[PDB]
């Protein structure tokens with residue numbers, strides 16, 4: 001009976017705000033009016049993006065922004081709520097450009113959360129901006145706080161939470177309370193920056209929206225799927241950085257939670273969150289891309305998958321060779337490395353030389369261009385069936401996506417997600433989830449239900465013996481043990497009872 005969240009980013013850059021129009025897609029390709037009533041109903045959240053933190057260490061619009069045009073654009077979004085009383089228009093602070101380790105505003109994020117007075121000033125600025133512009137909540141997309149900054153970041157979420165809760169009371173908004181989310185890492189390497197303190201990060205949130213995409217890109221040696229649901233044994237594997245996090249666990253605890261190497265998948269990230277105690281499945285939201293990542297210079301044989309490649313990683317894109325055949329948006333944006341789903345439909349439909357292929361382990365599509373040596377990893381309405389089924393099975397909070405302007409005109413990706421969660425006549429009970437590699441880590445937060453004979457005092461237990469005691473199932477790490485389970489370092493808690 002609890003509706004899955006469906007959280008869609010709406011991005012619009014300052015120049016497009018300042019020149020805003022709904023009737024000239026060469027100035028504003030994706031005006032608010034493209035979000036029809038039918039789409040408004042299919043969404044639960046729209047994250048307006050991006051705001052920033054300025055050098056006064058406050059939430060702020062880009063200072064080049066025209067305030068009147070900004071208010072007008074935001075009002076058009078909040079008008080959508082007339083079609084859907086569940087809808088929230090969040091705003092989002094950060095993004096890669098502002099907040100990455102070398103981003104233009106990076107130090108402001110670091111400083112804004114550093115001290116108690118700075119957090120007070122920052123937190124207040126967030127809720128003031130929310131109220132002043134009519135937003136329904138605050139999303140933080142800082143990519144990413146490093147381990148040293150993480151206590152500040154946590155305290156800043158806690159302080160924003162408290163102020164949001166005051167505001168909910170003031171405005172009598174218990175029916176649609178003001179919400180706090182973050183865009184959280186969706187792969188272990190960035191996740192490791194705050195993993196040890198995950199429960200504290202998630203506690204003040206309504207959701208943590210996992211960025212379980214961009215798991216592959218020009219920075220890797222080898223082409224791969226950017227958002228594989230499950231692992232492909234033929235694909236690359238990675239060092240599990242989480243095993244080096246400051247957790248204080250034992251060798252066995254670490255080994256049983258963090259297999260390494262591992263397959264960098266959506267399912268990995270979700271399980272890595274669930275493993276942690278105090279991180280509930282209902283607060284975890286699976287991110288999906290509405291775009292593809294394109295690679296050139298690939299070799300044939302396996303559809304361009306798991307190939308070396310010659311895709312430039314530099315920013316800005318280093319020349320005017322827009323080699324992604326058929327991609328008109330790429331020419332407009334001067335970058336061939338990203339293509340919207342909208343665009344990819346057109347590329348596949350025209351005579352551009354792509355095949356659409358399907359990897360039945362990862363449960364994701366990909367384009368291959370055999371003649372030129374191109375590979376594109378993306379998501380579509382089919383991959384979303386498996387991802388939606390997984391969402392339901394794991395009792396996650398919902399789905400998030402970047403971004404709305406990349407759906408096709410009819411909004412088929414959004415419609416498909418809404419249908420897989422909510423359509424009375426949609427049935428995925430027979431949908432086969434395949435034999436891709438699952439992430440098998442177990443931690444304190446996701447012990448399976450087990451049974452075993454009750455521990456008996458005086459009994460000598462060999463290595464691997466399983467007993468039950470005080471609510472859990474326990475396993476000896478070596479033999480022979482007679483100590484009560486949990487009373488020393490010889491027992492591993494492996495399961496929970498009854």
Ligand SMILES: C#CCO[C@@H]1[C@@H](C)[C@H](OC(=O)NCCCNC(=N)NC(=O)NC)[C@@H](C)C(=O)O[C@H](CC)[C@@](C)(O)[C@H](O)[C@@H](C)[C@@H](O)[C@H](C)C[C@@]1(C)O
Pocket residue numbers: 009011013095096097141143183211214315316317335338402
């Ligand atoms: C959050 C994300 C992605 O940001 C956008 C870039 C970084 C864009 O990055 C991507 O779209 N990545 C895929 C999504 C990855 N998502 C996230 N990291 N986070 C997320 O999804 N959060 C919810 C890159 C390629 C770019 O053009 O960069 C060019 C230069 C190469 C750049 C930085 O000049 C941009 O042109 C920017 C000037 C401008 O377009 C906006 C501000 C950035 C944007 C929206 O295009």
Ligand SMILES: [Cl-]
Pocket residue numbers: 175176177
């Ligand atoms: Cl709610």
